Structure formats: C-alpha cells, structure tokens
Design a binder for this molecule. Structure first.
Ligand SMILES: Nc1nc2c(ncn2[C@@H]2O[C@H](COP(=O)(O)OP(=O)(O)O)[C@@H](O)[C@H]2O)c(=O)[nH]1
Ligand SMILES: Nc1nc2c(ncn2[C@@H]2O[C@H](COP(=O)(O)OP(=O)(O)O)[C@@H](O)[C@H]2O)c(=O)[nH]1
Ligand SMILES: [Co+2]
Ligand SMILES: [Co+2]
Lengths: 359, 369
C-alpha cells in the first residue's frame, strides 16, 4: 500500500499526534508499506466486532470482508428473547464458518459465565446492579479486548457490524496494519477518518487553551473504526456509549500530555504514545439509527471533554453555551491487572454462549 | 479468495453459461482461488477505464484502487473546450502517476491521430460523417481494446469511472481474475452482478427460452458494465455503438455460437467453447445518478438489441413493444431503433495501427507503458 508519509505532527508531553494521512494507492513523500508485511502483521491482530441487533446481511458482509488471516472476535449484545436474535447470529456464524473456516470466537455480552469471571478476579466496574455485565458498547469492547488478550493478540482492531460496504471493512483492517507498520512505539493507536466536527473542534480546543495556539491536528475524535497495540489497550481506562472514542483521547492527553507520575508508567513515558490518523479511500456508509442517537452522540462526546480536568472555564462555558450540567461519563478501570489465564478458564468453564472455531 | 464453486450451468451449442457465483470470502462447494495466483494473473490483464466528464474525485478514487500490477488504459471523451476537461484529467493523471508510478496509457476518443489510424487501415465502422471518431461508450471501449492489444494484454477488464466506492473497483479486478483462473477455455468472459438490469435479463432469458421451450433465469448479467474478456474473445466480437454494447455481446454470442453452424470460420472457438462466468460481488454497486432520460435510454437500447436479434420471435418482439410503449419511452406505433454494430477488430494489423496512432496523436500520454 502507498500512503502520504507521516511528516507533520504535534507533540504533547509523551503524546505524538500525527497529522492525518491519505491512502494513495491500495494494492502494492510517499510511504510504501508492502502488501507482504501488512499480511504478515494481520496474523497478529484480532478484529473485534461488537454487535447489537444489526441486520444479518450486513453482519455477513462484514465478516466476509475481514482478511482470513485475522482472528475474528464477536461480542453480541443482541436481543435474547422474542425473538432470540443471538440464536440467529449463531446460525449465521456457524454457516459462515462452515464455508470459510475463519478463526472465530463469539460470545454474548450478558452471558452469566462472563459476570462470574469478572467477579472472581475482582474486576467489578463492568457489572451493573444485578451483578450482570452492563449493557453498552464500551462493555462489549472490553469483553472483546480480554478475549483478544486470551488468544495472544498483539494488536486489536475494532470495526462496526452495520457497514454497507464490505470492501471498506477490508480496507480498515489493512489501514490499521499500515499505521502500526509506520510507528516506532509499542504504544500505538490508529484511528480512521472519512457532530464529529463539533467533537474535534472541542478536542483541539482542549489543548489549544493551554498551548495558546489554535490547532486542527485531531480529526478522529469520534472514530469508531480504530485499532491499538495490546500494550496500549491494556492500560487504558474505558468509558461507554458515544463517549468511548473521545474519552480515549481525553484520557491520553490528561495522563501523558505532561510528565507527571512518570514513575507509574515509566515504559510508556519512555517510548511515548503514537496516534496515527488515516483517511480511508472508501466512504463511510452505515445504518441510520434515527436522531435520538445523533443528539445522544454529541451530549456524551462533549460531556467527556466538559468533565476533563484539562478543561478551562472558557471551554466549559462554550460547551454549555453550545449545548442542567452534562452527566459525568461512566469510566471503567484498565484491564491490565486481570490474570488473563485465570479469567479465561472461568469464562470457558461457565459460559453457555461462548463459541470457538479454530481458536 | 473464496467463491461458491461453479457447479451449475447451461450449455447452448458451444456457449457455456455458468450460474451466478457469490464471493464468499475476500482475502485467502467452495472454490479456493489463492491470492498469489490472482496476483500473478493481474500483470496480464489491462484495465480499461472509459470516461466522459465524470467528477475528478471519483476518477481519482477509481485509479487508486486498481491493483498496481494492472496496466491502466483510459479513453476519455470528455469536453474539449470551455473548459478543456481533458486537460484537467491529464493534470489529474499526471499527478496520480508522480505519486504511484502506476503504468498508464491515456488518450482522448476524438484525437484526430486515432481517426487517421482507423481510416488508414480501412476500419471505418468507428468513423462518423466527417471521418472523425464517433462519440459513444462502445466506441471508447473499442479504442481501449486496440490499445490493450497493442501493449500485449492477454486479458481486458472494463471498469466505469463514476464509482463512489474505490473498494468495489479493487474487488472487480480481482473477481475478473478469479473467473479467468476458474475457466478452461481461452475464450472466456466474466461478468459481475450485484429495474433496468432485471428487465434486460428477463428478455435475454426469453430470447433463449423461445427456442428451448423451457423458461430459464441463467442470464443475470445482461447489463454488466463491469466485465472482462480474454483478448482472444474480445478481438472476435463485433461491438455495438454507444450504450448498447453489453447486452449485445450476449446476443451476438448466442446467435453465432449458440448452434453448431458454419463452424470452419471459427474453428478453434467451437473446439474450445466460449465460457461465461457470472460473479456476484461482495460490494454494492453505487455509482452516479445521471437522471431519468439516461435511464430510459439504457432501457430502450437494451431491449432494442434483443428486439432486433436474429433469435427474436414475434411473441418476443411484441412483448418488448408493449413494455417499452407502456413504460412510455417508445412512441405508441414506433419500433425500437436498430443500434449500429461495428465489426470485430481482429483483422486490424495492430502494429500498423499503433504506429499511426503513436506518430499522429496529440492527446496520447504514456507512463511506463
Ligand atoms: N457488544 C455490543 N455492541 C454494541 C452495543 N451497542 C452497539 N453495539 C455495536 O457497536 C457498533 C455501534 O455503532 P452504531 O450503534 O451504529 O453507532 P454509530 O454508528 O456511532 O451511530 C455497532 O456494531 C453496534 O451494533 C452494545 O451494547 N454491546
Ligand atoms: N470513452 C468514453 N466513455 C464514456 C462515454 N460515455 C460514457 N462513458 C463512460 O463509460 C461509463 C458509462 O457509465 P454511465 O454512462 O454512467 O452508464 P451507467 O453506468 O449505465 O449509468 C462511465 O465511465 C462513463 O463516463 C463515451 O462516449 N466515451
Ligand atoms: Co453505525
Ligand atoms: Co454509471
């Protein structure tokens, strides 16, 4: 693959944010990431697909588009009764596997075997009040991340299951790889770029207020399509809903944007954190969920920044003016401390929905 | 790549039509066509991109998605003055080249250097009243075909320049390769599938059933703008003018090879057979909306090609008139026009033609090709 070379970037403490780079040529002042080395990295990357009540036909297209090389991790939070959509998804995955021999793990977010595993290792931020896994995208992602960690993945890439364009999914995974192949830190994040303009406006404002120089470096504030090395992923606290993506940025800037407590994450401060932003060649066509979603998305997004400890009054004032105070985003602790072998054994010993195919 | 295996098909004389097959898995009762094999074949296939006044960003996306290995042939019939859109396209292509070094050839359909070469070799089917190359997509493809032959391509694949999905284009090229890798004959065609299409197919299938007595639905790629052929097949096909080209390829193949007749003339074609693959892409087809008239015209030309076929019957012709008139695009007592058909280019001595083009074309630009 050919891409614009990573030239311009902005540094905030230990955080390097690379300017957005366009994919120049798909199949191969320009960076040349040979097809050969991309495929080589693919085998070390788990593609996590969090889904919830999506049309099977879209799900089918997405799964078929993921490079065979990549282990697929599906976390469903689909409706369980009247009708059991989880069952329909299971039938779909079984058929898909019978025709492709894809390496796949799937599990339902509400499996009581999952709740049991988290309680026993003493990680309870993911549990709701009835002691079951809380409903939500961030929760499903966390579950997916632990499963990816349990199979030894070095990189994890997330892709939404409601994409109308299978080929874009195929490109996303390759672009994540390209991004990882262009970085020099083991702590790397790759975010894809095609309200989000509102979100980016404020994220940049979050840093501007301190530097005194207006910036537009961040253009992936709401990027659902992103990937990270497992080393970075395991140390990040995670929020949920529409706050996940922007919270990753806010948290990284908050914690590593200055040299405070370097002692606690000495290796991260040493290597630094790299954030690549890649503009895909394919446009973005997904399901239209109605606007009580769009409104939600912006409320949660700006709330994440509004509550950041980096937010000055000016910033807070403006966010309010632009939008009662915004609810504080629910944040869950990093999963690093979790003894993975132990967690995994409890999961596979008590989960009634966990399905594995060559993995 | 994984596709459903080519299990079912229907044979008409020396013509084999494979039942449509779906792509099952992108990168790798199921046929496994490994990536490495597809990549080896791409070097031998030229991708022809006929374009006329399309948006530059769309054109850009299409060229960036064609596998680097494939030589690219562009034939533009874009506006020449007020403003010179061909120049905007040349700037675009020059920039694309400096960033990727893709092998490319581009020329403008109306280049007087082209008309000179056709005229000089005695091929006038393509020239209009004043001896200039006729406007029309079929005519642009014919030009692209000779260029592809001139540079030694074994296969040719067509791709429309107004695709909103670069990825779909990347898939099309690989699907063509898949089809050729699954074929056995040197005379092979690969057509991609994803109301006009449905209507055209309804009648092409009818064209056949009027003779077999059994209703079929085997043909599902009647209006397949995205298709490929081995050069060996491409060079023996007459090509219809303007937008009537794709359905006519099916019609002519049925009329001429649908029965064992006058075999000596196409000796080897009858020996090897003609194979047509139909592959349903994983990607959706999303291209530019050109409006109602355009859609009516595609309809009119598609059915006209079938209405005038030698295989057509009275029942079929009447069913077509009712449909066209009833659909309001054919006057109440008017029949479909008979699209002009240009002859096969096999007899054109390509060296001779290519020399004339090279020595007289003002729009011809080559990049490592
Ligand atoms: N596992 C899991 N997945 C979810 C949940 N909610 C949404 N998803 C999926 O995560 C992705 C979210 O994208 P979408 O809901 O379309 O949000 P948008 O595209 O930002 O408006 C889709 O694949 C959803 O099906 C959830 O509660 N649990
Ligand atoms: N070279 C050439 N290309 C053409 C001509 N007319 C159309 N094209 C191109 O061939 C493809 C035709 O697509 P379109 O006209 O949109 O037909 P559709 O896909 O059936 O709606 C596009 O790339 C057009 O830009 C022509 O006269 N000459
Ligand atoms: Co969505
Ligand atoms: Co079109």
């Amino acid at each position: 693959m050919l891409l614009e070379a990573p030239v311009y970037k902005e540094i905030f403490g230990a955080v390097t944010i690379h300017e957005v780079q366009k994919v120049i040529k798909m199949d191969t002042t320009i960076s040349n990431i040979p097809r050969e080395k991309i495929y080589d990295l693919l085998g070390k990357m788990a593609v996590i697909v969090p889904m919830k009540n999506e049309k099977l036909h879209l799900v089918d297209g997405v799964l078929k588009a993921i490079p065979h090389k990549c282990p697929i991790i599906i976390v469903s939070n689909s409706k369980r009764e009247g009708p059991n959509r989880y069952k329909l998804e299971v039938d779909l995955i079984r058929h898909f596997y019978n025709l492709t021999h894809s390496k796949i793990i799937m599990i339902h977010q509400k499996d009581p075997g999952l709740a049991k595993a988290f309680k026993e290792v003493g990680y309870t931020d993911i549990l709701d009040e009835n002691g079951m896994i809380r409903s939500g995208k961030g929760e499903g992602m966390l579950v997916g991340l632990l499963l990816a960690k349990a199979i030894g993945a070095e990189y994890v890439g997330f892709v939404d299951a409601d994409n109308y364009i299978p080929g874009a999914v195929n490109e996303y995974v390759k672009d994540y790889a390209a991004g990882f192949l262009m970085s020099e830190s083991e702590y790397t994040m790759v975010r894809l770029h095609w309200v989000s303009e509102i979100t980016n406006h404020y994220l940049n404002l979050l840093v501007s207020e301190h530097t005194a120089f207006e910036t537009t470096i961040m253009v992936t504030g709401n990027a659902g399509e992103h990937a990270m090395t497992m080393k970075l992923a395991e140390i990040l606290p995670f929020s949920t809903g529409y706050s996940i993506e922007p919270y990753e940025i806010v948290y990284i800037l908050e914690r590593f944007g200055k040299w405070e407590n370097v002692e606690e994450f000495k290796d991260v401060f040493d290597q630094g954190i790299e954030i690549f932003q890649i503009e895909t060649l394919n446009p973005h066509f997904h399901e239209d969920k109605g606007k009580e979603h769009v409104k939600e998305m912006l409320l949660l997004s700006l709330a994440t920044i509004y509550h950041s400890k980096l937010a000055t009054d000016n910033l807070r004032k403006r966010i309010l003016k632009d939008l009662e105070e915004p609810p504080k985003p629910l944040v869950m602790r990093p999963i690093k401390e979790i003894p993975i072998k132990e967690w995994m054994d409890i999961v596979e010993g008590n989960s009634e929905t966990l399905l594995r195919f060559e993995l």
